[PDB]
């Protein structure tokens, strides 16, 4: 028998029936913190230092490790491109802070795409443009300060392969598509027009099935999520493909009494982790 | 040749039949698999992840759906008030429909096990108070008042001291499994009712909002299972998908 | 240390007779009796396919003339299988369903059909073209009327430990006013949903179709024997009987002293 | 492929065929069984339980069917009188039809074994007397008198001293099994006749009723078996069951 | 193979044939005092004491143990509800005597439903109303005294799941149903309109296939039957479902000479055994 | 389409093409088409003798 | 399913074919045999008389 | 966690989790395409059709698959063919 | 139907001419002074 079944190479063993020389012709048969509940760093004044930069959190049980997996360089068993990759390390795996957003009582919510956010920032950006192939994980840190008299709750989540959709002309008759500035808004991010369906026909209420953390003003002022590289290929174009989107949505609206500070910003600070590149040539912006 | 007799079932195509079929490509080998984070093996892994419950599922906020994701709590002038109520049936129309637990439940006919409802208070740090959250097993309607609701399974939550609390809805049923409850004979399978009452009051000092919101999430516990796989009522097709 | 002190019935063959309860009131001889008891094992009594439904899809008329039918699964419409089952209060079993389909006069034509099991809560087909026929999760059988009868195994599906032919109660709490007495005796644990059938085509089939469903009980267990039905059946869901003509269980004769 | 030849029987649907069929629900597991009192494994267990015989199955009491469940005994003025008679064929129309033994017999073509008929006297404690209960093997008609009936298998019962007595109808047949007897050639299978006569008299002191009743019950003994499962004549369907 | 056959978990082993991964797809195959004859207490002045009450019988060979099984609390292997049950013991497992019935020369017969008879009586009643789930066995004791010059015979039987039917309008054309007061008559019980068919289209003549005892006036004045809990679920609602009915039917009519006492009563005394409750909340009457 | 049913002595006989006896809940029946190969079954030794 | 090819002879009913057929009565046991004088096993026994 | 907020009894729970294994959830054949070759009309009236393989045209199977971002599998395709009214002919 | 809720015995005087009802000591105090109308009714034993 040829070992060409789709399940060949998995830890689970199935008992199947077959009458042909190819394994995939066989019957499906029968088989014979949790990765999905946003595992905290512990389950798997504080200071996270990476490169020449340091942010300050409070607890390791407050850092989510997406899918329970820490970022890593691509192993030889999964690699396919044969050139030696460049792993610049400290010049690219460090914290970059993007433009700050302003949280208002009627804000809808925002999203950023990765690695799009940094393709034009620092040495990371340069490497992303000079190489065809890119790969990395990310430490995502969202910051929001308010007083003990303010209230509100942001859901901060990482949605892998965040494909956006349109309102189809309102009536649903128009097969319109999101424009480039909407699918890859860059460093400044973009605003959601229908946060309830994440501008993609899926419920915000179930977004917690993805790696996430809440920023509930009365309890915390920051959220930190560590994201491993996720894709169906070991390396990919940092320009053509965004591996995941970061969503920051006010599920419980911001509120405070008149006279309390009304300028409440939200700041995103991100650090590539284990960034590596391959397929060197001239710089390409898109 | 070998003597054989064709039996009933011959030539039929049963969609769930797990048989063998001739491979169209001899000697073909697939692209090897690479490690990808987030593999799941059993839908129960997803059912145990908390997702938001639309407790505030009003006809009046269908056009501002975001408001369905949290419900209000505020300074009361009369004591023992009912804050919110809803059934505890995971696969029934209502608040549970917005949870991924509820949606996966709809791909099965029966379920069993304990559930968990987590309430997250998102008012200010200066706001404090206590609520009584009760799970009333089958028997009647929404308890008419707190002194009746407290006779059932319940937990007293101080949202001043802790922002989140979890109410466990323990599996209390006559049958080992429940088909999804709905009006009529199937109400025999109802899980019961969940109510949240003011134990003391929502209290604040001068300078903080007198109304805040609570977000409720739900998930299944480790003893939860589902049975008899079926198609869901929550997706249809009225026209071509182009 | 403790402050409070208060805190098999039927063997494989028939019994032999020994030479001198016969050998108690009369003089007996020895009989080496090897008569088998296997045929009265409940499995052999029940594992015989019997008619449980006749579904029709005529082309003319005032019912099911649209090439599809949603049949609420209720197996108490045919006296023979019903009476056998009702010999017991509770029964647990798997079942083999066989679908014998033909035109009203028994002729067969090359017509493609689809049978779909729609469990409680699954959306029911509302036309011959409904999206539910996509059957992406429900089990469906596609078969031709010229093929041998379709046949499948259905496992024991009740939320309870056994199906129950008699449920002395109501499905839910509440006042039980006269207007809702139909509720009495209704056990949702026996309600297995819908069985849906259609001719497979967006255009209407010119053939009138009659489907006879047979069920064969297997891997059976039974509890609590009860008196066997002695009045004709009237309704599927209750034991109502015709009060004006109560049948005697035994035939009659003129005198108790003559045959 | 492997050389095969289809044989006669191909495509047929035989209702009693014990084969395998494709399972419609892969990976489905049923609600586990729980212990329930009263499980039965073989119909013979039921056939051995006594049930009431309608010995008094008169055309004149069909409208007051309860009266068929017991028969009278009373002070006699002439000795040796016949009190009641009936055939001993368990599956034949008549008194045995009311017993569960009789009704289960009808789901089979043949039977074999000894039977038991229990008589329970329900007169007063002050009433006494003796009856002669006889089982006459095949050969003629109802014995014309007691001095003829006593030549067969019989027991003398004192209902004053014991309220119940059991007459054993021992298996006395030419064949190892009997098909159910009925007029015509099948009378070859008749079991015989049962008669109950006054041995002395039903006697009472002043103050007690001069007529009382006896209830007769029947069941199979441990050597009883049945053969060739078939449909019964005792249930039909003339119209739709709605 | 998946062990999902309906016979899985039984003491009997069957030899079957299968070609599929699911056990229930297999063929039926072949296999490879008495519980039904109303076993006496011995086969499995006397005084039965339970709680603060005592009745007086005569012999243990005169007590029927239904289906040969003594009442017991639900074992952990069969339980499904997870809350700790309440087993009040002596306050509920004790003898309760209901309203007495009067036996007349033309009486048809009576029935009572369990646990309906006691849902409004004593501490048992309160527990039955305060809890969703109930479960118990019962000791049923029927009493009838008469003189040595009286005669008559009552058949006292326990019919599990005693579903009642109607006369269908007499003609059989009306699909009428028994009203609530008929299906659950409570403590006072109800009268049979057609005892020959037990008001349910089945023969009274075969009722002895159920746990029973005769009260033949010339021999005995009482009947005692011990009933275990019987249901397809381990616990159930004491309000919505009656596990069994008690039938007392004069198969041989009462008789006596003029001048003998004509007031011959029949009294029912019952004791819940191993009663347990779960799913506590407010009191619900129905 | 045809139906062959074995009706042992004492079982009710069909009195029409639609008789209830064709429900065949206990008697053995064979449903077969005239275009199928000849139906075929094994009958055991059934005499009382 | 298992690959098979129907061969000539398929569907034919040969009267002397010694095959197996589905039993119509599951769990049925015949009346036991009793000793009877004069059993014969081979027609030659008769030809020699 | 029941035995944390309420008093519990012991329950020997043997309810299976097999039916929710993704294999049993997905290994059920579902409609993914309806191809027509009419004899009359303005499309595919020439007795042949080239159907671009796109399995996202039917809601039921699509929604189940879209519960996940990535899926790897082999597939069994079954071709149920008939005339528009379900009749079959020797073609 | 109210009396039967307490301690009781069912006696068949046909079968046995004598029966004994035990009035078990059920009191709040270890001893009772003799009950009589007024405050001392606190010591009443109950009713037969
Ligand atoms: C793919 C086609 C298969 C569909 C076959 C129909 C399946 C019907 C469900 C089987 C349930 C069997 C249990 C019946 C219990 C009796 C319920 C009742 O009628 O009161
Ligand atoms: C000989 C006839 C066999 C041909 C059968 C059709 C084969 C079609 C290719 C199968 C591809 C299965 C993977 C589908 C992946 C989904 C792609 C998509 O629709 O976006
Ligand atoms: Cl848009
Ligand atoms: Cl379709
Ligand atoms: Cl009525
Ligand atoms: Cl028919
Ligand atoms: K033997």
Automatic annotation (TrEMBL), chain H:
Protein name: Genome polyprotein
Domain of life, source organism: Viruses
Lineage of the organism: Viruses, Riboviria, Orthornavirae, Pisuviricota, Pisoniviricetes
Role of this protein: Protease 3C: Major viral protease that mediates proteolytic processing of the polyprotein. Cleaves host EIF5B, contributing to host translation shutoff. Cleaves also host PABPC1, contributing to host translation shutoff. Protein 2B: Plays an essential role in the virus replication cycle by acting as a viroporin. Creates a pore in the host reticulum endoplasmic and as a consequence releases Ca2+ in the cytoplasm of infected cell. In turn, high levels of cytoplasmic calcium may trigger membrane trafficking and transport of viral ER-associated proteins to viroplasms, sites of viral genome replication.
Family under the similarity heading: Belongs to the picornaviruses polyprotein family.
Subunit-structure text: Interacts with protein 3CD.
Subcellular location: Host cytoplasmic vesicle membrane; Host nucleus; Virion
From TrEMBL, chain I:
Domain of life: Viruses
Compartments, record wording: Host cytoplasmic vesicle membrane; Host nucleus; Virion
Family listed: Belongs to the picornaviruses polyprotein family.
Entry function: Protease 3C: Major viral protease that mediates proteolytic processing of the polyprotein. Cleaves host EIF5B, contributing to host translation shutoff. Cleaves also host PABPC1, contributing to host translation shutoff. Protein 2B: Plays an essential role in the virus replication cycle by acting as a viroporin. Creates a pore in the host reticulum endoplasmic and as a consequence releases Ca2+ in the cytoplasm of infected cell. In turn, high levels of cytoplasmic calcium may trigger membrane trafficking and transport of viral ER-associated proteins to viroplasms, sites of viral genome replication.
Quaternary structure and interacting proteins, as annotated: Interacts with protein 3CD.
Record-given protein name: Genome polyprotein
Native source organism of the sequence: Coxsackievirus A16
Lineage per the UniProt record: Viruses, Riboviria, Orthornavirae, Pisuviricota, Pisoniviricetes
Residue span relative to the full protein: 470 to 517 of 2193
């Amino acid at each position: 028998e040829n070992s060409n079944s789709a399940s060949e190479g998995s830890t689970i063993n199935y008992t199947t029936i077959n009458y042909y020389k190819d394994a995939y012709a066989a019957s499906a048969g029968r088989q014979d913190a949790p990765p999905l509940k946003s595992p905290s760093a512990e389950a798997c004044v504080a200071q996270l230092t990476i490169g020449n930069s340091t942010i300050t959190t409070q607890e390791a049980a407050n850092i989510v490790i997406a899918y329970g997996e820490w970022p890593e360089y691509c192993p030889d068993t999964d690699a396919t491109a044969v050139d030696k990759p460049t792993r610049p390390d400290v010049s690219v795996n460090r914290f970059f802070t993007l433009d700050t957003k302003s949280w208002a009582k009627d804000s809808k919510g925002w999203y950023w795409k990765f690695p799009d956010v940094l393709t034009e920032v620092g040495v990371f950006g340069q490497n992303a443009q000079f190489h065809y192939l890119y790969r990395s994980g990310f430490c995502v840190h969202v910051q929001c300060n308010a007083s003990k008299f303010h209230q509100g709750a942001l859901l901060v989540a990482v949605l892998p392969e965040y494909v956006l959709g349109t309102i189809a002309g309102g009536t649903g008759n128009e097969n319109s598509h999101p424009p480039y500035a909407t699918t890859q808004p860059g460093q400044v991010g973009a605003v959601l027009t229908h946060p309830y369906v994440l501008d993609a026909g899926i419920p915000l209420s179930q977004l917690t099935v993805c790696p996430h953390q809440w920023i509930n003003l009365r309890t915390n002022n920051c959220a930190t999520i560590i994201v491993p590289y996720m894709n169906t290929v070991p390396f990919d174009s940092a320009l053509n493909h965004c591996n995941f989107g970061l969503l920051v949505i006010p599920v419980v609206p911001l509120d405070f009494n008149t006279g309390a500070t009304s300028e409440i910003p939200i700041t995103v600070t991100i650090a590539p982790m284990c960034a590596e590149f391959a397929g060197l040539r001239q710089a390409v912006k898109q | 040749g070998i003597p054989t007799e064709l039996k009933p079932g011959t030539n039929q195509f049963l969609t769930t039949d797990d048989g063998v079929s001739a491979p169209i490509l001899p000697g073909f080998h697939p692209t090897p698999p690479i490690h990808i984070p987030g593999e799941v093996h059993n839908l129960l892994e997803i059912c145990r992840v908390e997702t938001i419950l639309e407790v505030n599922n009003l006809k009046t906020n269908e056009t501002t759906p975001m408001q369905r994701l949290c419900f209000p709590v505020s300074v009361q002038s009369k004591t023992g008030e009912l804050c919110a109520a809803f059934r505890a049936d995971p696969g029934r129309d209502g608040p549970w429909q917005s949870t991924i637990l509820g949606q996966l439940c709809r791909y099965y006919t029966q379920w069993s096990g304990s559930l968990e409802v987590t309430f997250m208070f998102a008012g200010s740090f200066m706001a404090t108070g206590k609520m009584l959250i009760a799970y009333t097993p089958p028997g009647g309607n929404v308890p008419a008042d707190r002194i009746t609701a407290m006779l059932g399974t319940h937990v007293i939550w101080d949202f001043g001291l802790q922002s989140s609390v979890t109410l466990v809805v323990p599996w209390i049923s006559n049958t080992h499994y429940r088909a999804h409850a709905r009006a009529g004979y199937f109400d025999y399978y109802t899980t019961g009712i969940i109510t949240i009452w003011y134990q003391t009051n929502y209290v604040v000092p001068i300078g903080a909002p007198t109304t805040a919101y609570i977000v409720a999430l739900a998930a299944a516990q480790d003893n939860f299972t589902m049975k008899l796989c079926k198609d869901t009522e929550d997706i249809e097709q009225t026209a071509n998908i182009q | 240390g403790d402050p409070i002190a208060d805190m098999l019935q039927v063997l494989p063959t028939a019994a032999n007779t020994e030479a001198s309860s016969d050998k108690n009131l009369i003089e007996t001889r020895c009989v080496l009796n090897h008569h088998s008891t296997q045929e009265t094992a409940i499995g052999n009594f029940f594992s015989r396919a019997g008619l449980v439904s006749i579904i029709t899809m005529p082309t003319t008329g005032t019912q099911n003339t649209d090439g599809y039918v949603n049949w609420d699964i209720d197996l108490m419409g045919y006296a023979q299988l019903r009476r056998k089952c009702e010999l017991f209060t509770y029964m647990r079993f798997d079942a083999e369903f066989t679908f014998v389909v033909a035109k009203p006069n028994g002729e067969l034509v090359p017509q493609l059909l689809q049978y779909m099991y729609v469990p409680p809560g699954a959306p029911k087909p509302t036309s011959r073209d409904s999206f539910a026929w996509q059957t992406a999760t429900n089990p469906s059988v596609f078969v031709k009327m010229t093929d041998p009868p379709a046949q499948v195994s259905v496992p024991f599906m009740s939320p309870a430990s056994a199906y129950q032919w008699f449920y002395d109660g109501y499905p839910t709490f509440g006042e039980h006013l006269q207007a809702n007495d139909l509720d009495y005796g209704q056990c949702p644990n026996n309600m297995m949903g819908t069985f849906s059938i259609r001719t497979v085509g967006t255009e209407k089939s010119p053939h009138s179709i009659t489907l006879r469903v047979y069920m064969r009980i297997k891997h059976v267990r039974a509890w609590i024997p009860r008196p066997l039905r002695n009045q004709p059946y009237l309704f599927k869901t209750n034991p109502n009987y015709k009060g004006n003509d109560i049948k005697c269980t035994s035939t009659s004769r003129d005198k108790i002293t003559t045959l």
